[PDB]
Amino acid sequence: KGIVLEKLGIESKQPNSAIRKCVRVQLIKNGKKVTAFVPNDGCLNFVDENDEVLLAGFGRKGKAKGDIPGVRFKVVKVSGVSLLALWKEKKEKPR
Protein backbone atom coordinates (compact mmCIF):
# COMPACT_ATOMS: atom_id res chain seq x y z
CA LYS A 1 0.00 0.00 0.00
CA GLY A 2 0.98 3.59 -0.27
CA ILE A 3 -0.17 7.17 0.05
CA VAL A 4 -0.11 9.35 -3.02
CA LEU A 5 2.25 11.99 -1.83
CA GLU A 6 2.23 14.17 -4.94
CA LYS A 7 2.26 14.12 -8.72
CA LEU A 8 5.29 14.55 -10.93
CA GLY A 9 5.20 16.15 -14.31
CA ILE A 10 1.81 17.68 -13.73
CA GLU A 11 3.35 20.79 -15.29
CA SER A 12 5.19 18.90 -18.01
CA LYS A 13 4.06 20.15 -21.41
CA GLN A 14 4.97 17.19 -23.62
CA PRO A 15 1.92 14.91 -23.29
CA ASN A 16 2.11 11.15 -22.68
CA SER A 17 5.78 11.50 -21.71
CA ALA A 18 6.82 9.08 -19.02
CA ILE A 19 7.55 11.82 -16.48
CA ARG A 20 3.98 12.92 -17.04
CA LYS A 21 2.76 9.50 -15.95
CA CYS A 22 4.68 9.10 -12.73
CA VAL A 23 3.39 9.93 -9.25
CA ARG A 24 5.41 9.99 -6.06
CA VAL A 25 4.14 7.72 -3.39
CA GLN A 26 4.91 7.08 0.25
CA LEU A 27 4.68 3.50 1.46
CA ILE A 28 2.91 2.87 4.73
CA LYS A 29 4.96 0.00 6.06
CA ASN A 30 8.43 1.54 5.99
CA GLY A 31 7.85 5.22 5.60
CA LYS A 32 10.08 5.32 2.55
CA LYS A 33 8.86 7.25 -0.44
CA VAL A 34 9.30 6.00 -3.98
CA THR A 35 7.98 6.79 -7.45
CA ALA A 36 5.33 4.83 -9.30
CA PHE A 37 4.15 4.52 -12.87
CA VAL A 38 0.47 4.65 -13.84
CA PRO A 39 -0.99 3.10 -17.01
CA ASN A 40 -3.00 5.15 -19.47
CA ASP A 41 -2.16 8.83 -18.73
CA GLY A 42 -5.81 9.82 -18.42
CA CYS A 43 -5.74 7.81 -15.24
CA LEU A 44 -3.79 10.54 -13.56
CA ASN A 45 -7.08 12.21 -12.90
CA PHE A 46 -8.19 9.38 -10.67
CA VAL A 47 -5.44 9.60 -8.10
CA ASP A 48 -5.58 12.87 -6.18
CA GLU A 49 -3.47 13.29 -2.99
CA ASN A 50 -3.87 11.16 0.10
CA ASP A 51 -5.37 8.28 -1.78
CA GLU A 52 -4.42 4.75 -0.91
CA VAL A 53 -2.77 3.35 -3.95
CA LEU A 54 -1.95 -0.31 -3.84
CA LEU A 55 1.28 -0.73 -5.78
CA ALA A 56 2.61 -3.77 -7.59
CA GLY A 57 5.98 -4.41 -9.11
CA PHE A 58 6.54 -3.00 -12.55
CA GLY A 59 8.74 -5.87 -13.56
CA ARG A 60 9.11 -4.76 -17.13
CA LYS A 61 10.53 -7.22 -19.57
CA GLY A 62 11.96 -4.62 -21.94
CA LYS A 63 12.81 -0.97 -22.42
CA ALA A 64 11.26 1.26 -25.09
CA LYS A 65 12.14 4.38 -27.13
CA GLY A 66 11.86 7.03 -24.43
CA ASP A 67 11.49 5.14 -21.19
CA ILE A 68 12.78 5.82 -17.68
CA PRO A 69 15.40 4.00 -15.60
CA GLY A 70 14.07 4.16 -12.11
CA VAL A 71 10.34 3.66 -11.96
CA ARG A 72 10.02 0.24 -10.40
CA PHE A 73 6.43 0.03 -9.19
CA LYS A 74 3.05 0.54 -10.72
CA VAL A 75 -0.32 1.49 -9.38
CA VAL A 76 -2.97 -1.22 -9.33
CA LYS A 77 -5.80 -0.16 -7.10
CA VAL A 78 -6.74 3.37 -6.16
CA SER A 79 -8.72 3.60 -2.94
CA GLY A 80 -10.21 0.15 -3.19
CA VAL A 81 -11.30 0.09 -6.80
CA SER A 82 -8.96 -0.92 -9.57
CA LEU A 83 -7.70 1.33 -12.32
CA LEU A 84 -8.92 -1.00 -15.04
CA ALA A 85 -12.35 -0.69 -13.55
CA LEU A 86 -12.27 3.07 -13.49
CA TRP A 87 -10.68 3.55 -16.86
CA LYS A 88 -13.10 1.09 -18.40
CA GLU A 89 -15.87 2.91 -16.53
CA LYS A 90 -17.23 -0.06 -14.70
CA LYS A 91 -16.93 1.25 -11.16
CA GLU A 92 -16.17 4.64 -9.77
CA LYS A 93 -14.01 5.88 -7.00
CA PRO A 94 -15.60 5.87 -3.56
CA ARG A 95 -14.41 8.94 -1.78
Binding site: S12, K13, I19, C22, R24, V34, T35, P69, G70, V71
Partner: peptide
Protein backbone atom coordinates in the same frame (compact mmCIF):
# COMPACT_ATOMS: atom_id res chain seq x y z
CA UNK B 1 10.03 38.49 -21.71
CA UNK B 2 7.15 36.04 -21.24
CA UNK B 3 8.68 33.43 -23.55
CA UNK B 4 12.02 33.59 -21.75
CA UNK B 5 10.65 33.31 -18.21
CA UNK B 6 8.60 30.33 -19.41
CA UNK B 7 11.77 28.69 -20.76
CA UNK B 8 13.70 28.97 -17.49
CA UNK B 9 10.72 27.79 -15.41
CA UNK B 10 10.20 24.81 -17.73
CA UNK B 11 13.88 23.82 -17.81
CA UNK B 12 14.28 24.02 -14.02
CA UNK B 13 11.11 22.07 -13.25
CA UNK B 14 11.84 19.30 -15.77
CA UNK B 15 15.49 18.90 -14.73
CA UNK B 16 14.64 18.81 -11.02
CA UNK B 17 11.99 16.11 -11.51
CA UNK B 18 14.46 13.96 -13.44
CA UNK B 19 17.00 14.59 -10.69
CA UNK B 20 14.58 13.31 -8.04
CA UNK B 21 14.05 10.13 -10.06
CA UNK B 22 17.86 9.97 -10.15
CA UNK B 23 17.86 10.56 -6.38
CA UNK B 24 15.68 7.58 -5.48
CA UNK B 25 16.67 4.52 -7.37
CA UNK B 26 20.24 3.41 -6.64
CA UNK B 27 19.57 3.81 -2.91
Amino acid sequence: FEARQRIEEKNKESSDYHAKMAHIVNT
